[model samples]
Target: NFTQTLQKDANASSEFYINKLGQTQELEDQQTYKLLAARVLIRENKVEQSAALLRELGELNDAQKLDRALIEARISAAKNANEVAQNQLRALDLNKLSPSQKSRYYETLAIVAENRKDMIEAVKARIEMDKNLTDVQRHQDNIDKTWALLRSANTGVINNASDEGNAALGGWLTLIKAYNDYIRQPVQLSQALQSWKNAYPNHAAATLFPKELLTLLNFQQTNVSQIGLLLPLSGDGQILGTTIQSGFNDAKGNSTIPVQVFDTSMNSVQDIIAQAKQAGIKTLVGPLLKQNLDVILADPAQIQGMDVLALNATPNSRAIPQLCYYGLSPEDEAESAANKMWNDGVRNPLVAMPQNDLGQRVGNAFNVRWQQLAGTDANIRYYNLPADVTYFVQENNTALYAVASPTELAEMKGYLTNIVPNLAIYASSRASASATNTNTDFIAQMNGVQFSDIPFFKDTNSPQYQKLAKSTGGEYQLMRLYAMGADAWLLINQFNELRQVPGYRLSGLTGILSADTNCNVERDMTWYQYQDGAIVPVAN
Candidate 1:
């Protein structure tokens, strides 16, 4: 009877095998014992000797499939050579073998490939090792390789199409796929996208293509590309308008695009159109006022062939035809903010506002957008504080000021904490203030409300908001003027292409800025929330 060794020591195990082999008498038994000795040598890390013995055994019996598999595995483990072991295993039809044998073969191949640092191939082999499982790594590697090959192939296709004056469907599809992938894995493929655009200028899958592409390219290649910036550079909106102009100037410093700034304040709508026509301005980015929209649209003959992008939303009159509107009105901003909050699982929203026209506009906009998104009317509680009111006082002292009672404060707190609905308190007010006692007192009294600024506010260290807990205080988010600046630059930068398409849509920081079929700007609004004494973007 043969006894199997149960020793935990490698040296003792080898000695036990040798002793058993020495006691064996028959030549056939001796040969079987010698094969066992080869396996022990392999286990003990004697790789070269183990290989030599296996080759001798193969010479005698033309090694069985099981014996060859064992030999390859031992060689791979001893020499730590995965690629060689994989090649040896692949020499056999492993896939046609039993499931258990196939799994073993694949596992061996995976180990070998992994040792060689061939991660993609290793992952593929590992996936085959377990037929019942999904391998995400292998799938991802395949996708990456496919995208790389497609991009490379399309480069040649783009060049051929450009030379032959034909459609570049392959290049266009590759660009679109690359862009869509960027929308998903932005960090991974950003460089690849930049490289693709640099290699093929006309191949970029911008929003406008084909007819617009041809028109814009022809315009750019032949005529000097001209950009018209219509802004209220000298009126009540001068300060904000100059800020937008500064952004335009910054953009122009980097590119050769010629831009002419038109002061809408200096010219009548008719004069502006006439001047634009005389100057050969192919694209007009703005005319800030809504009133000017009608005048520009009425005299379509003067600016007929040119594209006009209005800076404000157009009224419902079909007679006035502006191509797009780019400003985010207060209503648009509020609605966007409310939608964002609602989407983030806010059920109940509390609105706090200084009793004024601007606040009313914000509240109305929030209601409109909320209803549109929720498919039902929303419950909005309005806390309208009067313009002159100061301090949180009791109701009995009616002579000095109109103030909320302690009981009312309790009720508001209860409303805030109640689980029947999620709560978001939206406040709207002007951000400007003088460095005087009056402004300080006013701000101190208006604490504990989420504020939305009508325009950009520069002060963060003001006594009113800085002293209180950021979570329960008067702080606001402003996206208005900043968003206007961003949109202005966006239009100016893409003027040539935008003039061709006329009707193109884009979402900006403040709202939805798009062009109608007539090439007029369409301005929507955006919202933000006060978080930790700072105004940040809300979901809408």
Candidate 2:
């Protein structure tokens, strides 16, 4: 009771574990007692006590050695000795242990893997451990953790071509690719599900999902077969809104639902709602500008019947959520950049962004997110579009760079490398452009810098990419809105199911989509590395 109490709350339970250790030796089964004492001492940060107990455990076997190593490794990890913890844990011979005990070795390895910031390794180790487990709860626990690890490390884990063939693995990929496809592209949920069923027919998730996931697989089918898109077609967002309107028409053949467009040039939110109501449309997707959504959120009662997925987000969550905030905002791009950089093992960085309202928002979002992951040690600098790298990244030439651009991307790269050689720079979707059908000069100059863009920017042979490209005569900027429009049509129909669950995501043309807890749908940008004089998508 005393030790378990300590196990539950370590900060306040020193008396609990310490007292239990004292009385432990009084009981019989001396070897077992010593082992228990060793664990308790380790938990209490009494390394010497733990070591002494382990030393006297009389010919400690492989299982016992693994047990001993797990304790030692965790202690080393607390001291920030990650490499030592890794070696100590990996040195244990898991195969030598009994079936019941072997998996603990990898479970322990998972601890070290995460601390080392290797989520893929942790997941692989977790899957390895499952072969030896017998407990039902433990079995499900691995499944849940695997699910989460894949969801988190979604972009990079299954870059291998045979990912699905292996049930998503070079290392226990598990429905990783299958489920990832579902989360990454909710619009293709039906197709991905069929692919999953064909590939991993007997997988546990076939049943485990739909049971837990609040998705189209379980939620009510969309009753509103048509959607109304309210756009500022004649105003400030005319270029953007007009482009999405065109993409909607282009994707009419691909869309599951018929979509109608309304110009919100002089209309209020209520007026836009009125237009949708007049059209007999029940589902709405609109209000592209930040200030427009701000109006709706500031006064929700004005649009009582609206359950919109606004293309832009409000700053915070609300008391009674009516709208699903969705947009291709700079804010989402920066937040995704932070996640990407952190996952890429970047610790400290110098964020160089264009000096504007958008840049401040992106830089601040990236800084806050990175500070959460690492610390506030990173520097933020605002720079002109033709950013002189020295003006921004001058102080920390060696630190990683998070550069968002608005000018010639090739020039941006030259400015960056002019100051720092081979610097690891993080950038946003704005950094890359479609080849102009001849954007190779831009691609060649971007050799070392890493960034991401809308999926529509990718020059794939896919029908959708090809159609969007051919139709727009390969205008990259137009395709961004085109992709957004296509994804909006899908979300307006599917978001009801998507918003119901946690960690479930959607594949969108803009990025991999997921709803943040604040009731706003957030996007995680996909990555690209400029290599061999051309840009290629990072598989993760």
Candidate 3:
């Protein structure tokens, strides 16, 4: 009676039970009322008062003893005394518990696991609790929580957990592993998922499937008859446009589809769209400038049927289904560094950015993403002078995100190495971009420093990259634009897959590309660390 009431209306149940306890005269009746009252009070989140009542109770019956034990463990959990609660709950014999009581036991264990930040333990407890749930919504919630815990868990943590002898756990572990392994390759991911389902046909995930994975089946591939490139062939933006065009031309080397270049400097954006539309080009790949992007986004009606991959991103307020934004923004690099540090288990991180407009944006980007992942702000310091970097290092350690130029980083690292021995230093792509004259010095001084940059830099040995580098003079910044252009061709072809499949990522020249809900293309960059005076890809 009390359980049903508590589930329906905790406050009413607490009110009714507390009054009933006061009126109880019989010993058995009084003890029963107290247990019921404590439970209702717990449901009301009146943990302290509930504890006071549980302590006062004189319990004798087996059922009463079980109720009291569960209540006490719950009270301890509520008080954040998770270890105490864990011990108390673990002492209970599950064989003695009713199905509902077993559910509560696992539920309380999940709470303790969460408090201790033991993600796998929480997932295990939730999986156990799932057996007792009859409600469909409860089952769905349990599955979602299980997936969330698995997703949030570091790959290292997930890998270390033994799935041997446990079918349920093995299924979950394999499922998540498949997701991590093949997230960038949607086709392979789907095949892995199909095989996983065949292996664990009766698993809850196999039946319902994660919506993210299920959506992949519905994805339609984009078809491009002809591609229209909107770029400034003349004017101040000419160099960037041509660099991108060169990358595009290089990437589309042997493709059957014809690509036509429309000079944005020579024609208005609307006129370009109209002219391209008349010529039957289904894909539009740039305006190359932010101002040009603003023009098309302000009124995207003309380019409704055609796919538009603008080279610049818009404010969050301006997203349309027909348009996708892609760019080489500093914010993207900053966030990627933050994620990399967090994934590498660098708990206490310090960020050092230059004291300038770009620095403020980059620092905040890292700060925001880091806070979301770590539940605490990363210490960020903006430095005007090189020595300021050393002073910031004085404040803390663990890892340093050096969001500065290669010259600035070289000085900062030299000072930092003297200050804190073996400090893990990370830098943005800024550390990799260098003028030819200083390339040798940059590579030498950047030894032991890890940085993330476009995948364009990683495949320098490939014939395609080598050929492109020869023509482009291989300047780091220009090569990045070239990579962006190559990714644009790749992105245009996968437009359908990106928009439809939420967790899907395309391996592009820029990075592992994925589209967010707003169609803002996000890049997960490749990691490289300077070793023995050469930039080498980090295996991890």
Candidate closest to the true structure, highest TM-score: 3
Judged by TM-score relative to the true structure, which candidate is superior, 2 or 3?
A: 3
Residue lDDT tens for model 2, 1-540 = 222221121232334444554556633234444555566576577877677666776665444455667667766765668788878876867555555445655666776776776787877677677766776666777777766766667465465534444453532353556555565454455455555655665665553443234343433445666677788888577878888887666556654777677677777767777767777777778778777767777777755665677887655535345578777777777777778777777777767777877778777878888888887646777767655556766654444545554245556667767576677766776765555325666656666677767755565788767776777666677788888887876677666655665576678778777776666777777777888776677743
Model 2 poorest 10 in a row by lDDT: 1-10
Residue-level lDDT of model 3, residues 293-353, one tens digit each, is 8888778788878888888864532568768888998888888988988888998688888
Instruction: Give me the runs in candidate 1 sitting further than 4 Å from their true place.
Output: 1-224, 235-240, 299-302, 317-322, 348-364, 379-423, 428-448, 451-483, 495-540
Error of 2 at 62 (Å): 37
- Number of colliding residue pairs in model 2: 15
Residue 282, candidate 1: Cα error in Å is 1.3
Model 1 scores a C-alpha lDDT of 0.49
Error of 3 at 132 (Å): 5.0
Cα displacement (Å) at residue 20, model 2: 26
**lDDT score of residue 119 within candidate 1:** 42
